[PDB]
Design a protein around this nucleic acid. Structure first.
Lengths: 320, 330, 327, 326
DNA sequence: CGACAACATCCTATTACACCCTATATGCCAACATGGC
DNA sequence: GGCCATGTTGGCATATAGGGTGTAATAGGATGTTGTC
DNA sequence: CGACAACATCCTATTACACCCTATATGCCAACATGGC
DNA sequence: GGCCATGTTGGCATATAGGGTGTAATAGGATGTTGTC
């Protein structure tokens, strides 16, 4: 049952995400390695061994949410085979909490993406607007779409040409079928502004993606400025990160050698940027939840949590 | 249903007896769909050598993947699975859907077909501009058919009723208000609580249309006669009071009206290429949204009970664009 | 009665009856009523009533149908037998195919014969204004109390039972003079935080007048409204609240005060009732163009379906579509 | 360890081994509830562990008979649930009887007239009146308290977070304001933000305190410290100012302004630790500041919680009021 | 005890809110249908 | 007889409503109660 | 052709979303604490 | 020493914030790959 069950879950691989099946195998790889190094059987995972293992991961210097992720992957591995979850016995459930508290006491916080607020969009726009290079048009159009629709980069990577339409006012409509939370055929329709519409029109006209309606919107642009529209090859998200990084480097310069995360703009920058800008502009809750595709408010808060408090509502209120 | 029959369980035999004892407990389009699904299931079971009752996880999974292989939609596969669940549950047997084997493959199909580019088709909008362009064409036609169809396009747009409800309208259902407007009192709606309301009113502009129809067709000669009936060739109307104009016929009216304006259809083989039964409702919703009518009044006009359903019909407007859109142009 | 059946069943039933206040009093009234009807039918028909057999219940529901009773009533009886058996720890009679299918069949048969659930006759803004201009100047105690009540019920959309449980210590105030009212227990929410219904200026004035003339402010624990005895003798109480029957008669007396008597057909909702206050206000908000989130806030709704269920009987003549097509 | 009484024993050793998994206060509530339960059980001759559903029922009804709030009883029940689930035993809340009497206690106590009380708001008007009273007085006490009320009203921080503020966590900006960096938050994610800022007046007040108290000597010193008789400041880098004294500031200020707390045995008759946040949220809602801004300024993660603070305002009186005022 | 206003109590019948669930519509085809020219 | 509108009837594909279940209210008539003349 | 810009691939570390469950703060009390006049 | 201002310490009472568990995404280095002047 716990052998010809997994091949039952493995049978329908696209039932779960790809990244899920990557991280599961990864965590299992690490777990197996640590188990072979310390002379311990790795299946089924016994609570004490799991405890010492999570303790090891803590001792190494890994974050809390990473360790919790391994424990969750072991949970999935066991539960998907009808076996008792490791996080059901106290020995693990408690040491997890202890690890969290001990790490937080050390002064540990979860990092967030670097803000890509409106002023940055403008400052960038006043640099690549004149330039008619196939790189600059694409990148600027992509920053525009990213800041306008608050979509994740993987979602912008799957935007086919046959999804773009138009409101009667001339604004573009992007239809998204699958997101991180929503997986429906009805999907959602994110509307673009006018400026972004011009920025993307100027890319569609030049790149030559208007040929096949099944073409991917954003595509790779090779060395000397030659585009390569494909309807089968999706533009990787890593490139979409490198675009943000390239822009940020273009403006502020190269980043240093500390090797720290979110020191430059990333794929999550536009989301938190638009969220912060909307929160700062008196936009109500349901509108912010709609613009970002959120079904909860805690998420919105978790996004706009790091607003610059010096120009906050309180400091402004204590003016009088 | 006596076309495929396998019997090994006799406890089940008592369970089906009550099902046949209370046939009216389910609608016609439910029994028809159940048979239409079970014949497919039995056929595929015969061609693949699998016992069709009681069904089981791994054998049903193959059937679902087979339905996906035929390029069918997700909601239709869900429909088949649901009918299988009905057949199983009404026989006192557990549902094959509960098992992880069928759930996982179901969600697999739902993910795959979504990534393949499957999109739910919303009906083509029949709006005020369209209807007025119809009323500029078929207005002074001596033909009885054009009068009937124009009156119908008036009722459908004005009342936002569904074709089956328009078909059930008898002559005695029509009242005259104090303001001379026609008050269509809905007869036998198959629902206790009719959220849309049980009396839909007409404007004067449509009232004169309906009046012209009844005075050039002669349906008001009998109080129990169906309002919209069939108009036979060379313009000979045929009242009934015992036979309804099929819904397909009304759909044919809509298709004829779209064809009459924008030419013949496409050789694409799809849905909602032309106007249909939902057209008047969607278009009216859009026209109320453009008129700044509040969502509650719209939902009360159509009879919807969910706001998102209405929001789907107006998502391509400028009224409900993004907040970021309004934030980026100031 | 009872009659020997299990030991775990008696213990469970006895356990449920023990903590009677956990459920509504009306739930118990109706449970005992349904059990009485079902038991009487059983003895008349020489059958056992516990545990209920799936085809004794069927004949019973068919009997109720042919008795002239409504669909939802039969439905309720079934749901209550279920409420008995599922608390007893027994299989529900609703889960057998006979009962469920005969239930659906009863519903469909009665609907196809022309049956619709009635709604309370609406008490709209125009009616509140008419009654206002009718009573507002009276020195008579009953008129003051009644008008104050109608004002509260129309302004707050509170169910009459919730209004009859309003104490003076529950009423606070805003700077603008607008009265605040704390409601602790409703039909959907049972919490200590409760809700804070806010009155307008005029309604506030009405309630102020009622408070002044009645003298219920002598104790914060007094119920806001109370019974008026002959010759206008007010009897403020803190131990005994006003019944909802009286609250209904207020509506009925007010309605017949304007539109004369009732006719002897026997149909329901010929005159105003307790629910009339809610419905009307809802149909006054939809017509006014009030957004959904603001309407759900003024009634304590968590679903839009109930709102639509409320305003479903709006006037189509002055509706949006007729307005739009006659431009 | 605590009130004594076989496979469960190993699991309780499991629980008591990893003790820093729960907060200290969690442990104290657990031990308190266990003590009350054990006492009531010994009085009525009942096996206090494993807790039977019936005995738990009688005990909950007893706690109700004592005149305790629904939330308190719920807390006791949740502690017994904690212990029982931590022992692998069936939680009493899962049984029918306990569920029934919990529902019952709820309905009956709500019908009794029980209410959840809101903290008395400490708004701008009150802060300015207080500032008008003190401000010039050259005593260390008044300076400290003024600075504290200032920071509390400015940052909307909870008193325990204000108590942990060290001098090294204070920064300065170009504008001439103060930037209080939260040293250690109790969590992994801070919705309220980890960088609070102060206005100019609040800045000059706080820095007046820092200047006159001598806490600037050590960057590791806590911002607010204990003040002794005749105004002797006691700067310490280890001994944190307690929360009860921090709210003593509030209620003593409320005494200085108004009268004295009337003997009714009630809460929120005076200002407490929550007063600043409530008052600030009310001031922002009054000023027209949107709900997201407020929720982020305070750290609240649900709209209704903030809506409760301003349920008595005029701008939020519902639609029927707008409909009728015509 | 009554009159009499104005209630409170009981009872069966019926509607109402909210969470989770599935049935019943419409879209549109190929396959028959039928009266009036 | 034939032709051609102008339909009608499963049948199958696909989308959208409506109902089950649980608990708690109101609707209203028949009857009982209660404090003054 | 060679450089090589401009990407895709892989693995591990870390965050994001959402439904659901419970932990950990504050309120305020009585009893105890300790410098500095 | 004494004594008061002015706190601090656990407790019980009450309320408000945060985490657990599942699934899916991104962050970014190290490494490999491909048209194209």
């Amino acid at each position: 049952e716990v052998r010809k069950n997994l091949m039952d879950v493995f049978r329908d691989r696209p039932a779960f995400s790809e990244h899920t099946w990557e991280m599961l195998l990864s965590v299992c790889r690490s777990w197996a390695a640590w188990c072979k190094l310390n002379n311990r059987k790795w299946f089924p995972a016994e609570p004490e061994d799991v405890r010492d293992y999570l303790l090891h991961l803590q001792a190494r210097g890994l974050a809390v949410k990473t360790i919790q992720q391994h424990l969750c992957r072991l949970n999935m591995l066991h539960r998907r085979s009808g076996l008792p979850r490791p996080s059901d016995s106290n020995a693990v459930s408690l040491v997890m909490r202890r690890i969290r508290k001990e790490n937080v006491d050390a002064g540990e916080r979860t990092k967030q993406a670097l803000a890509f607020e409106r002023t940055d969009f403008d400052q960038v726009r006043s640099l690549m607007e004149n330039s008619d290079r196939c790189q600059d048009i694409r990148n600027l159009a992509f920053l525009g779409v990213a800041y306008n629709t608050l979509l994740r980069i993987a979602e912008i990577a799957r935007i086919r040409v046959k999804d773009i339409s138009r409101t009667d006012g001339g604004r573009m409509l992007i239809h998204i079928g699958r997101t991180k939370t929503l997986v429906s055929t009805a999907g959602v329709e994110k509307a673009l502004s006018l400026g972004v519409t011009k920025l993307v029109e100027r890319w569609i006209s030049v790149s030559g993606v208007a040929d096949d309606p099944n073409n991917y919107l954003f595509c790779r642009v090779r060395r000397y400025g030659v585009a390569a529209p494909s309807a089968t090859s999706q533009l990787s998200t890593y490139a979409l990160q490198r675009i943000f990084e390239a822009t940020h480097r273009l403006i502020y310069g190269a980043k240093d050698d500390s090797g720290q995360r979110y020191l430059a703009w990333s794929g999550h920058s536009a989301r938190v940027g638009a969220a912060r800008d909307m929160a700062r502009a008196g936009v109500s809750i349901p509108e912010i939840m709609q613009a970002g595709g959120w079904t909860t408010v805690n998420s919105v808060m978790n996004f706009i949590r790091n607003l610059d408090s010096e120009t906050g509502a309180m400091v402004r209120l204590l003016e009088d």
